[PDB]
Design an enzyme around this catalytic site. Structure first.
Site, mmCIF file in Angstrom:
data_model
loop_
_atom_site.group_PDB
_atom_site.id
_atom_site.type_symbol
_atom_site.label_atom_id
_atom_site.label_comp_id
_atom_site.label_asym_id
_atom_site.label_seq_id
_atom_site.Cartn_x
_atom_site.Cartn_y
_atom_site.Cartn_z
ATOM 1 N N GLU A 105 -13.778 5.650 5.543
ATOM 2 C CA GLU A 105 -12.543 4.898 5.336
ATOM 3 C C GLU A 105 -12.629 4.030 4.096
ATOM 4 O O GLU A 105 -13.714 3.510 3.779
ATOM 5 C CB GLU A 105 -12.270 4.024 6.542
ATOM 6 C CG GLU A 105 -12.055 4.865 7.801
ATOM 7 C CD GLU A 105 -11.815 4.063 9.066
ATOM 8 O OE1 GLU A 105 -11.779 2.809 9.011
ATOM 9 O OE2 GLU A 105 -11.708 4.710 10.132
ATOM 10 N N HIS A 140 -16.569 -0.507 9.811
ATOM 11 C CA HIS A 140 -15.302 -1.220 9.651
ATOM 12 C C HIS A 140 -14.939 -1.989 10.916
ATOM 13 O O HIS A 140 -14.482 -3.138 10.852
ATOM 14 C CB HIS A 140 -14.129 -0.294 9.296
ATOM 15 C CG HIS A 140 -12.833 -1.023 9.270
ATOM 16 N ND1 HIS A 140 -12.521 -1.914 8.275
ATOM 17 C CD2 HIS A 140 -11.812 -1.073 10.152
ATOM 18 C CE1 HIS A 140 -11.351 -2.458 8.512
ATOM 19 N NE2 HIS A 140 -10.888 -1.954 9.639
ATOM 20 N N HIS A 151 -14.445 -5.944 11.491
ATOM 21 C CA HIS A 151 -13.148 -6.438 11.931
ATOM 22 C C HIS A 151 -13.238 -7.290 13.193
ATOM 23 O O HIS A 151 -12.586 -8.349 13.296
ATOM 24 C CB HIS A 151 -12.191 -5.265 12.165
ATOM 25 C CG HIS A 151 -10.937 -5.642 12.897
ATOM 26 N ND1 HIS A 151 -9.857 -6.220 12.264
ATOM 27 C CD2 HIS A 151 -10.597 -5.533 14.210
ATOM 28 C CE1 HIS A 151 -8.903 -6.449 13.151
ATOM 29 N NE2 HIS A 151 -9.326 -6.042 14.337
ATOM 30 N N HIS A 201 -11.290 0.577 2.617
ATOM 31 C CA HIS A 201 -10.691 -0.655 3.057
ATOM 32 C C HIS A 201 -10.708 -1.713 1.970
ATOM 33 O O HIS A 201 -11.518 -1.645 1.033
ATOM 34 C CB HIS A 201 -11.448 -1.196 4.254
ATOM 35 C CG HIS A 201 -11.234 -0.386 5.484
ATOM 36 N ND1 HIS A 201 -10.025 -0.366 6.154
ATOM 37 C CD2 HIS A 201 -12.047 0.478 6.129
ATOM 38 C CE1 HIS A 201 -10.117 0.469 7.174
ATOM 39 N NE2 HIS A 201 -11.330 0.994 7.184
ATOM 40 N N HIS A 202 -9.847 -2.721 2.140
ATOM 41 C CA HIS A 202 -9.733 -3.808 1.171
ATOM 42 C C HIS A 202 -10.588 -4.958 1.595
ATOM 43 O O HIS A 202 -10.589 -5.363 2.745
ATOM 44 C CB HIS A 202 -8.264 -4.184 0.947
ATOM 45 C CG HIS A 202 -7.491 -3.093 0.260
ATOM 46 N ND1 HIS A 202 -6.880 -2.063 0.945
ATOM 47 C CD2 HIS A 202 -7.310 -2.830 -1.051
ATOM 48 C CE1 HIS A 202 -6.343 -1.228 0.082
ATOM 49 N NE2 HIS A 202 -6.590 -1.668 -1.139
ATOM 50 N N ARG A 239 0.820 -1.209 0.000
ATOM 51 C CA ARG A 239 0.000 0.000 0.000
ATOM 52 C C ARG A 239 0.843 1.243 0.000
ATOM 53 O O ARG A 239 0.346 2.315 -0.293
ATOM 54 C CB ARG A 239 -1.041 -0.004 1.133
ATOM 55 C CG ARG A 239 -0.505 0.340 2.475
ATOM 56 C CD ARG A 239 -1.557 0.293 3.614
ATOM 57 N NE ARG A 239 -2.223 -1.003 3.669
ATOM 58 C CZ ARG A 239 -3.509 -1.197 3.391
ATOM 59 N NH1 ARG A 239 -4.305 -0.163 3.087
ATOM 60 N NH2 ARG A 239 -4.007 -2.433 3.464
ATOM 61 N N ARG A 287 -11.399 8.542 14.723
ATOM 62 C CA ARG A 287 -11.760 8.149 13.361
ATOM 63 C C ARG A 287 -13.123 8.677 13.024
ATOM 64 O O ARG A 287 -14.147 8.180 13.503
ATOM 65 C CB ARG A 287 -11.686 6.641 13.182
ATOM 66 C CG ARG A 287 -10.305 6.121 13.430
ATOM 67 C CD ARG A 287 -10.265 4.641 13.754
ATOM 68 N NE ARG A 287 -10.623 3.824 12.593
ATOM 69 C CZ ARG A 287 -10.378 2.508 12.501
ATOM 70 N NH1 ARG A 287 -9.764 1.857 13.496
ATOM 71 N NH2 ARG A 287 -10.742 1.842 11.408
#
EC number: 3.1.-.-
Lengths: 134, 82
Positions: A100, A127, A131, A102-103, A5, A96
């Site tokens: 975002e 997210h 997670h 994200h992958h 990345r 935060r």
């Protein structure tokens, strides 16, 4: 290990059709996809890092009247600088506070960094929920 | 920078305008300002005052300052300096 990345790469992929309330979707399910029209603008372009890519994404959002139209004037100023817009307070997690990128398939299991079909737009809260269930 | 009563209203309006204009060098610096704003106002809507205003609330800089000002007045909290 060297971070993929943090290395340049070329954006690929199609994204998906989304509506003018696309960012409401970032808070549920697997997040919102990259908008197909964003993908159309970024595909085949080279970026210096994933952070450089994400900035380009938010710039393209601010330039697209349909994707930016639900954003209030202050959030609009933010995306015009290439920053991520602020989510609703109830979607933030500590420091935060912005959406975002994200992958979906992790890079360590063969997900690509700039594959725009492998990227999801999430709230920090969504997210973290995802997670924590892994 | 410690408490809202350390700012004059004109100082707080400048701060709020910086935020609404995204007049920072980075996203991180803007989020920091937004966090400070929320700490200063102590308003439970947090960053929503700026980004997600209630229907018919004025989300211009001066609009936001007035909403903060009145909410703190209504809730017996200290006002601006000066």
């Amino acid at each position: 290990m060297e971070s993929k990345r943090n290395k340049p790469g070329k954006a690929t992929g199609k994204g998906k059709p989304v509506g003018d309330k696309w960012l409401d979707d970032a808070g549920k399910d697997s997040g919102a996809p990259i908008p197909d029209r964003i993908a159309d603008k970024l595909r085949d372009k080279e970026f210096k890092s994933f952070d450089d890519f994400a900035k380009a994404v938010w710039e393209e959002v601010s330039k697209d009247p349909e994707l930016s139209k639900n954003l209030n004037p202050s959030n609009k100023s933010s995306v015009s600088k290439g920053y991520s817009p602020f989510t609703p307070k109830n979607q933030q997690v500590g420091g935060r506070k912005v959406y975002e990128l994200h992958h979906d398939k992790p890079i360590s299991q063969g997900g690509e960094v700039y594959d725009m079909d492998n990227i999801r737009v999430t709230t920090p809260k969504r997210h973290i929920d995802i997670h924590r269930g892994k | 920078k410690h408490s809202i009563s350390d700012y004059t209203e004109a100082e707080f309006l400048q701060l709020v305008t910086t935020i609404c204009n995204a007049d920072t060098s980075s996203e991180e610096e803007l989020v920091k300002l937004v966090t400070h704003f929320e700490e200063m106002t102590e308003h439970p809507s947090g960053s929503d005052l700026i980004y997600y205003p209630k229907e018919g609330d004025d989300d211009s800089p001066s609009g936001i300052v007035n909403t903060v000002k009145q909410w703190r007045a209504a809730n017996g909290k200290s006002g601006f300096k000066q």
